[PDB]
Design an enzyme around this catalytic site. Structure first.
Site, PDB file in Angstrom:
ATOM      1  N   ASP A  95       7.783 -22.354   6.069  1.00 54.14           N
ATOM      2  CA  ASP A  95       8.122 -22.910   6.639  1.00 54.14           C
ATOM      3  C   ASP A  95      10.130 -21.948   6.868  1.00 54.14           C
ATOM      4  OD1 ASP A  95       6.931 -25.295   7.027  1.00 54.14           O
ATOM      5  OD2 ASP A  95       7.540 -25.853   5.322  1.00 54.14           O
ATOM      6  N   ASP A 145      -1.590 -25.161   2.943  1.00 58.21           N
ATOM      7  CA  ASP A 145      -2.632 -24.694   4.029  1.00 58.21           C
ATOM      8  C   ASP A 145      -2.526 -23.472   4.419  1.00 58.21           C
ATOM      9  OD1 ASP A 145       0.038 -25.032   4.927  1.00 58.21           O
ATOM     10  OD2 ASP A 145      -0.973 -26.602   6.238  1.00 58.21           O
ATOM     11  N   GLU A 148      17.255 -29.265   5.343  1.00 59.56           N
ATOM     12  CA  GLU A 148      16.082 -28.717   5.453  1.00 59.56           C
ATOM     13  C   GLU A 148      16.409 -27.217   4.952  1.00 59.56           C
ATOM     14  OE1 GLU A 148      12.829 -29.117   6.158  1.00 59.56           O
ATOM     15  OE2 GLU A 148      13.500 -30.618   7.449  1.00 59.56           O
ATOM     16  N   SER A 151       1.005 -22.491   4.710  1.00 61.29           N
ATOM     17  CA  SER A 151       1.605 -22.540   5.848  1.00 61.29           C
ATOM     18  C   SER A 151       2.934 -21.876   5.029  1.00 61.29           C
ATOM     19  CB  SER A 151       1.456 -23.639   6.198  1.00 61.29           C
ATOM     20  OG  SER A 151       2.352 -24.254   6.123  1.00 61.29           O
ATOM     21  N   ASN A 163       3.697 -23.562   1.798  1.00 60.00           N
ATOM     22  CA  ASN A 163       2.966 -24.846   1.659  1.00 60.00           C
ATOM     23  C   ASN A 163       1.761 -24.193   0.897  1.00 60.00           C
ATOM     24  OD1 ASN A 163       4.811 -24.522   4.455  1.00 60.00           O
ATOM     25  ND2 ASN A 163       5.518 -26.157   2.985  1.00 60.00           N
ATOM     26  N   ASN A 218       7.876 -24.554  10.628  1.00 58.75           N
ATOM     27  CA  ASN A 218       6.681 -24.235  10.050  1.00 58.75           C
ATOM     28  C   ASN A 218       5.369 -23.033  11.198  1.00 58.75           C
ATOM     29  OD1 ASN A 218       3.035 -25.433   9.709  1.00 58.75           O
ATOM     30  ND2 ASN A 218       5.022 -24.717   8.248  1.00 58.75           N
TER      31      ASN A 218
END
Ligand code: NA
Ligand code: NA
Ligand code: NA
Length: 133
Positions: A56, A52, A38, A54, A49, A63
């Protein structure tokens, strides 16, 4: 931000200290395998991201659209009741608590695709070997 990356066994130990081993039936080796794919154990890890808007965050790449508020993700819901920035500090207390909240939902640790692709059903012992945990 410039990287702040734990050393495999120090994170293993810290997560153990913070009650992650066996949490929701998830072993430490699994939390280590997750953090690895990760963030590469980088507590400052962020990933946008574009789909959308967003992002992480931190060790577990949590998120902003569902778990932490980053004040920049339209139509987000803050289930952890934390600021995403809180998930980017050397002290992973707030981060671990959010990860715990994440795997308390029905899909548990399968919420993270990378965990599904890299860790699930595979030997993960390598991740905690040597750490003395
Ligand atoms: Na060292
Ligand atoms: Na060292
Ligand atoms: Na230590």
């Amino acid at each position: 931000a410039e990287a702040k990356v734990f050393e495999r066994c120090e994170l293993a130990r810290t997560l153990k200290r913070l009650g992650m081993d066996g949490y929701r039936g998830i072993s430490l080796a699994n939390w280590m395998c997750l953090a690895k794919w990760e963030s590469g154990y980088n507590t400052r890890a962020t990933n946008y991201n574009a789909g959308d808007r967003s992002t992480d965050y931190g060790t577990f790449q949590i998120n902003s659209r569902y778990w932490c508020n980053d004040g920049k993700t339209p139509g987000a819901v803050n289930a952890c009741h934390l600021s995403c920035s809180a998930l980017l500090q050397d002290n992973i207390a707030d981060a671990v608590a959010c990860a715990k909240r994440v795997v308390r939902d029905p899909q548990g640790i399968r919420a993270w695709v990378a965990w599904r692709n890299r860790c699930q059903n595979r030997d993960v012992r390598q991740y905690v070997q040597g750490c003395g945990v």
